[PDB]
């Protein structure tokens, strides 16, 4: 059977009803080794953990994507007018920083 935190109760024959109650002993350890805390909060809260990991992965992906987008556009904006000259001599420090040859 499945006993939750809200209760359960069987009658077996002519015995009185026994009531049972579940308390919070999830498997794992919530205090380290981050492949264990995910197992603990998956056996603890299954519905919340998957959506939480989904939105954290989505926020991390979108933030790193937009940061790389801004970095590439800043690199193009710094290296474009120094390349449209027919001699094209970038200064030394900016060629070291913005990854020019």
């Amino acid at each position: 059977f499945t006993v939750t935190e809200k209760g359960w109760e069987f009658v077996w024959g002519n015995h009185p009803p026994k009531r049972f109650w579940a308390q919070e002993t999830a498997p794992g350890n919530p205090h380290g080794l981050p492949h264990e805390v995910i197992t603990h909060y998956y056996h603890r809260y299954p519905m919340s953990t998957i959506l939480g990991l989904s939105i954290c992965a989505a926020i991390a992906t979108v933030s790193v994507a937009a940061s790389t987008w801004l970095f590439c556009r800043s690199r193009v904006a710094c290296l474009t007018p120094y390349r449209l000259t027919p001699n094209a001599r970038i200064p030394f420090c900016l060629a070291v920083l913005c990854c020019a040859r």
Binding site: A22, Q23, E24, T25, P30, P34, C56, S63, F71, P81
Partner: protein
């Protein structure tokens, strides 16, 4: 003095609170519900039972003819059969060959065991919750039945307490109820005069001794055997017995919210649904001044043991320095952790032990001892039993068991991304200003 509070509707578990008047002593309040009833308005429509087909003795006229005399008995049939040659133990009865005539009469009457074996068909509506409380307001303790409509106060020592109405109109009973032998069934019985044979309520008597019953039992008279004095009949079998054979289980086995269906009157007890609001009208004489009570200085709280179990599994030690030795209130404002006792007797320089109960892995709750506020802080451990046989003594706070390591993982994965995107935006702004600076020379 109006003090409004709200108690969860659940028997046995004590409820403790204090009234914090701003310049007077804190006033303890302790309310333990014992038995929460739930009584619907119940209206008897009829009863039913097994029936008994009554039969009349056959009226035989030797070489004549008979007629039908209606007695107006319930479900009464009266067919008259010609061409009979009946028999007794002493030879033939009539002496003709044809033209004898026998009258059969059958009717239905309710059984001889109707008084001690019958089903009562009620109608339920408009419940009326009632509760056996046990109220302690500043060491004035009573035990008194309350009616939890928004009025009908309970009065003791000048305090006027009124238990407000339930936050939910839920009833375990349907619109229609059958009682049979201490057990109650949500069963959609047919109306009076609408009974069908072979089902429930083919016999419908308005009360138990009504002397007027409705019988629809599909009684049909048959033709007797040649040379036999008896009344043969065919009818659909008893529907009270067939209803006892069907009988999906009682309402004390199928009702939600843990309800316990009893019937001296028809009622449910100890349903764990809803919550009772309370109304306190405390008079102005119970408030003692502060200076007639103990008051602490330099109090400190340390957690000895801490288990986030379902019972009281946490021990905190409070070391104090008291101005005077006397009992005073302890209370926790939030539902972060629920204490065991409502009062602690103090010495002047001792150390007190309180029992609390929490769901928090890392509890940081602010105790309230006599008038001060200490901050109890520690770490709890998982219990050892998977399944206990007593319900939950504390509240399930959202984000109560986050276990600080996972706060660090969430804060890293949620804050480092924001740090990277704002330094990207600042870098974009600086690059735009540097372009506008380098193009200035134009």
């Amino acid at each position: 003095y109006e003090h409004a509070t709200t108690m969860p509707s659940q028997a046995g578990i004590s409820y403790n609170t204090i009234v914090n008047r701003a310049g007077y002593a804190p006033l303890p309040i302790s309310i333990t519900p014992t038995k929460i009833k739930l009584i619907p308005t119940v209206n008897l429509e009829y009863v039913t039972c097994h029936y008994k087909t009554g039969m009349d003795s056959p009226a035989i006229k030797c070489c004549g003819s008979q007629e039908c005399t209606p007695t107006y008995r319930p479900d009464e049939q009266c067919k008259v059969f010609t061409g009979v040659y009946p028999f007794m133990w002493g030879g033939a009865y009539c002496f003709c060959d044809t033209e004898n005539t026998q009258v059969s009469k059958a009717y239905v009457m309710k059984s001889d065991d109707c008084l001690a074996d019958h089903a009562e068909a009620y109608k339920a509506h408009t419940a009326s919750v009632q509760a056996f409380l046990n109220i302690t307001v500043g060491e004035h303790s009573i035990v008194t039945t309350v009616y939890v409509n928004g009025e009908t106060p309970v009065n003791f020592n000048g305090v006027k307490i009124t238990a407000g109405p339930l936050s939910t109109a839920w009833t375990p009973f349907d619109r229609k109820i059958v009682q049979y032998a201490g057990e109650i069934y949500n069963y959609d019985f047919p109306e009076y005069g609408a009974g069908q044979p072979g089902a429930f309520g083919d016999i419908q008597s308005r009360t138990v001794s009504s002397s007027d019953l409705y019988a629809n039992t599909n009684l049909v008279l048959q033709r007797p055997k040649a040379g036999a004095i008896h009344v043969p009949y065919t009818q659909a079998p008893s529907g009270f017995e067939q209803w006892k054979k069907d009988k999906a289980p009682s309402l004390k086995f199928t009702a939600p919210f843990g309800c316990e269906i009893y019937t001296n009157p028809i009622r449910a007890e100890n349903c764990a649904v809803g919550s009772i609001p309370l109304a306190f009208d405390i008079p102005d004489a119970l408030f003692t001044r502060v200076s007639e009570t103990p008051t602490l200085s330099a109090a400190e709280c340390t957690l000895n043991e801490c288990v986030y179990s379902s019972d009281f599994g946490g021990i905190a030690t409070v070391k104090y320095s008291a101005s005077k030795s006397g009992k005073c209130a302890v209370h926790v404002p939030s539902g972060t952790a629920t204490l065991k006792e409502a009062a602690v007797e103090l010495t002047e320089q001792g150390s007190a032990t309180i029992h609390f109960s929490t769901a928090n892995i890392h509890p940081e709750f602010r105790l309230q001892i006599c008038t001060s506020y200490v901050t109890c802080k520690g770490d709890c451990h998982p219990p050892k039993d998977h399944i206990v046989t007593h319900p939950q003594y504390h509240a399930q706070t959202f984000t109560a068991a986050v276990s600080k390591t996972a706060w660090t993982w969430l804060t890293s994965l949620l804050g480092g991304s924001a740090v990277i995107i704002i330094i990207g935006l600042v870098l974009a702004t600086i690059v735009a200003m540097y372009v506008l600076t380098n193009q200035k020379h134009n």
